[PDB]
Design a protein around this ligand. Structure first.
Ligand SMILES: NC(=O)C1=CN([C@@H]2O[C@H](COP(=O)(O)OP(=O)(O)OC[C@H]3O[C@@H](n4cnc5c(N)ncnc54)[C@H](OP(=O)(O)O)[C@@H]3O)[C@@H](O)[C@H]2O)C=CC1
Ligand SMILES: CN(Cc1cnc2nc(N)nc(N)c2n1)c1ccc(C(=O)N[C@@H](CCC(=O)O)C(=O)O)cc1
Length: 186
């Protein structure tokens, strides 16, 4: 509820998403890792929190909305009322970060995950605090619309190992990828 965790899947050419969906073909095993990672809280009773941009919200299949067992906060400057399924709606990453720290919430939130938006990722990283990046490395080049900020290895450190995460190369539908975890604390 204090450290922030970004979770993204990026291609070799640091690309994410392409025209509404992801540039690469659907990787079912990568969704499982995404599901398990953002869904598993470390405490019984308390749930995980996921924050995402509005385009990301409507990208999730309607029947998989809201992401189950997780508190879903949608960010939007245009919407004035939370979209069906949305627990909370926030005007900005601060409105959201200050809401999450309210006594009323903190009592029921364990981990907070930023899961969607090149813009949200960017503003999440552009600010002090214990921050962690869970990156799924798609070992292949794809053409992408939107992208992901470069990782200053002078600011973040690669965790040799992290609990609950496996580090061996994975492969599905002929596409290779591996899980990585970076950390920053300032
Ligand atoms: N595989 C992966 O790792 C991921 C891929 N993607 C893909 O990326 C695409 C979405 O990219 P992107 O264009 O960045 O969309 P996002 O949904 O992340 O951001 C777009 C919208 O999010 C809201 N928003 C973003 N930042 C803020 C902020 N700081 N404060 C308030 N509101 C904010 C906006 O509200 P408003 O509209 O009202 O202005 C904005 O128009 C999709 O095609 C998706 O499938 C997304 C996440 C992960
Ligand atoms: C569009 N999109 C955004 C998306 C996709 N892959 C990512 N992968 C990673 N690693 N990180 C992200 N932030 C990420 N974001 C989606 C789309 C669908 C579902 C979804 O329905 N997820 C179900 C998973 C259904 C399943 O695939 O088992 C869940 O309960 O988490 C999630 C995110």
């Amino acid at each position: 509820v204090r450290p922030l965790n970004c979770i993204v899947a990026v291609s070799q050419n640091m690309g994410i998403g392409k025209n509404g969906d992801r540039p690469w073909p659907p990787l079912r095993n990568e969704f499982k890792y995404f599901q398990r990672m953002t869904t598993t809280s470390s405490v019984e009773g308390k749930q995980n929190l996921v924050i995402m941009g509005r385009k990301t919200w409507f990208s999730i299949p309607e029947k998989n909305r809201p992401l189950k067992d997780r508190i879903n906060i949608v960010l939007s400057r245009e919407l004035k009322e939370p979209p069906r399924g949305a627990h909370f709606l926030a005007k900005s990453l601060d409105d959201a970060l200050r809401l999450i720290e309210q006594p009323e919430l903190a009592s029921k939130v364990d981990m907070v995950w930023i899961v969607g938006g090149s813009s949200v990722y960017q503003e999440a990283m552009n600010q002090p605090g214990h921050l962690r990046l869970f990156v799924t490395r798609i070992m292949q080049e794809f053409e992408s619309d939107t992208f992901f900020p470069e990782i200053d290895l002078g600011k973040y450190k690669l965790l040799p190992e992290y609990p609950g995460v496996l580090s061996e190369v994975q492969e599905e539908k002929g596409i290779k990828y591996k899980f990585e975890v970076y950390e920053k604390k300032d």
